Design a protein around this ligand. Structure first.
Ligand code: 94M
Ligand code: MG
Ligand code: MG
Length: 214
């Protein structure tokens, strides 16, 4: 039907849709780097809210805790990365994030078509899109102090959606929910997540807590 006035559909910027298709279809085995890139993004988000609060302590009224949580769910086949950083506004989700990423995306594609491999995506500032190395659908729940709670979602293919979230309020931060591909379930294992974290994302300025399944 798609007669839901609460859900809006947008097309990715041409360069970004291209990058996503390239990431999805390239044969690349070193997929674990996706978790490092997302943990780096959360650390950046937490640095920003911590820095803003030095001049305005009321920015932490929405939560003093500053941490990162990793939550595998074997039943739903999802790996969720939660942080209490600055969050994202509606403008960020629709306009600003893609605009700021245009230049880095183009450059990254040149590097790839030259020699560089996918693991350097973070050097171009577009590491988030490495999530689709392992995820067929990505759902992002976010809350910025200056806006409402929103839900961003995309299964690639050139389009993404944005709606006002109706679920549990978070207070402030971001939840990245990775709906994992059938053959990428190794990233729901506790020993595997530990290895990847200790490898790269290890000197992070905030506590990283792994939720073990029951
Ligand atoms: C909506 O999904 C994203 C898109 C399409 C592009 N980049 C980022 C990374 N990213 C940007 N700001 C972010 C903040 Cl405040 N936090 C986190 N954890 N990631 C962020 C995200 C999450
Ligand atoms: Mg595609
Ligand atoms: Mg906690």
């Amino acid at each position: 039907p798609m007669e839901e006035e609460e859900v809006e559909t947008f097309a990715f910027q041409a360069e970004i849709a291209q990058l996503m298709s390239l990431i999805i279809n390239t044969f690349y085995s070193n997929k674990e780097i996706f978790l490092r890139e997302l943990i780096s993004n959360s650390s950046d988000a937490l640095d920003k809210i911590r820095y803003e609060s030095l001049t305005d302590p009321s920015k932490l009224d929405s939560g003093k805790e500053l941490h990162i949580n990793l939550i595998p769910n074997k039943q739903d086949r999802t790996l969720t990365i939660v942080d209490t950083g600055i969050g994202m506004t509606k403008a960020d989700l629709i306009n600003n994030l893609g605009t700021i990423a245009k230049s880095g995306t183009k450059a990254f594609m040149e590097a790839l078509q030259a020699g560089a491999d996918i693991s350097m995506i973070g050097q171009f500032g577009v590491g988030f899109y490495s999530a689709y190395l392992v995820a067929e659908k990505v759902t992002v729940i976010t809350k910025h102090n200056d806006d409402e709670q929103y839900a961003w979602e995309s299964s690639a293919g050139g389009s993404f959606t944005v709606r006002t979230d109706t679920g549990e309020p978070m207070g402030r931060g971001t939840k990245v929910i990775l709906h994992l591909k059938e053959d990428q379930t190794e990233y729901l294992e506790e020993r595997r997540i530990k290895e990847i974290v200790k490898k790269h994302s290890q000197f992070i300025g905030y506590p990283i807590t792994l939720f073990v399944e029951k």
